[PDB]
Design a protein around this ligand. Structure first.
Ligand SMILES: [Zn+2]
Lengths: 9, 233, 227
């Protein structure tokens, strides 16, 4: 799954 | 006691349950819905957790009794080891109903329990019968299962650290009735109003659970360091 | 050979309460905390390692080490350790004149060994008449301390003491005769006459066994290298 940091960005 | 905002990400703290079983009160800690699940907001999570860590650390410094509660079988084993490692006792699976309040009545139970343990290397050899022997062993086992891990306390504990909270709503009710502060790893389906330190994690996968256990374990060792000696060599 | 992780587990760093402390030991102390002095382990090991070297040196010439552990707790522990290395031990009161007054104690050991056999063989039995009780009880008293050195051991070449205060009487007689001494000095014990010194907790059961282990190890090793 994609990293939370990138998702939140 | 500042667990990387990324370590928990791999642990599994982000994955809650589905909407069909979602406490509407938990809205302050939501990030959206992956496959209709509910992804806890880690950014919202983390200050509270670290704050509680410090809170629990100052407790152990004042030498306030801590406690942990058993949950699922995997959770229970993990909780036991972390607790035994340092101190602060630990529950196991049932919480023995109204332990708090009926702490005086269960005190007599603890007394009988310890006597039997002592008499388990005494009464066993003499007057043993093919009937009484099974009685003694079996009863001890049952008593130990839950009462064991609490027998040490010899008094009223000054704190509590449960997991999920929902699975132990009973435990929180008694704690609220005495003032004893508590901490709970609330999840997407857990009423946190009764908790004084909302840890919006996820009681699941064990992995992440092991993280919380490891964390607090470390904070209570800092309390023991203030109770023993400072770091040096 | 011991490591910092070894001691840190046992608690060697733990020192007596603040009040009780000889300011002469301040160098071997790091920073006191919670009204308790914390030994500076960083200094302990370098000296403990040197002392183990010295003990190996001694055992090379087949010298006789003597272990002193009056402290009730460590007393039994010292007994066991001295067996593996076959060195002499004294786990009770360090009878005054133990070394200085050798002539008297030597005659005493003679009396002991003689009594030992007689009763062991059975002579004592036939006598009975409460006189057998007297000679058996005398053996017990003598063995309670004299035991451990019965096999000669005249004027050893070193003394290993757990505490550097309680056994001050021993740490003195040896200085008079010039016999080197070692001690697990704590923070409340005078660092005098100890020669090779070793800042270490002398109370905890855990820590004493650690010291006993390492010292017994080196002593037998030295015997083997000469062998
Ligand atoms: Zn859950």
């Amino acid at each position: 799954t994609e990293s939370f940091a990138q998702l939140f960005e | 006691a500042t667990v990387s905002m990324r370590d928990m990400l791999k642990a599994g703290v982000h994955f809650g349950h589905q909407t069909r079983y979602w406490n509407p009160k938990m809205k302050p800690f939501i990030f959206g819905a992956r496959n209709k699940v509910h992804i806890i907001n880690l950014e919202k999570t983390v200050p509270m957790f670290n704050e509680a860590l410090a809170e629990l650390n100052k407790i152990a410094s004042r030498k306030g009794k801590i406690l942990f509660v058993g949950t699922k079988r995997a959770a229970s084993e993990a909780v036991k080891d972390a607790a035994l490692s340092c101190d602060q006792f630990f529950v196991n699976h049932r919480w023995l109903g109204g332990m708090l309040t009926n702490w005086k009545t269960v005190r007599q139970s603890i007394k009988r329990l310890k006597d039997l343990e002592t008499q388990s290397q005494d009464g066993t050899f003499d007057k043993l019968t093919k009937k009484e022997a099974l009685m003694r062993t079996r009863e001890l086992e049952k008593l130990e299962n839950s009462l064991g891990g609490i027998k040490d306390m010899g008094g009223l504990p000054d704190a509590l650290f449960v997991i999920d909270a929902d699975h132990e709503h009973i435990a929180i009710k008694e704690a609220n009735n005495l003032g004893i502060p508590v901490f709970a790893i609330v999840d997407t389906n857990s009423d946190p109003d009764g908790v004084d330190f909302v840890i919006p994690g996820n009681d699941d996968a064990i992995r992440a659970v092991t993280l919380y256990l490891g964390a607090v374990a470390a904070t209570v060792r800092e309390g023991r360091s203030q109770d023993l000696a400072s770091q040096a060599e």
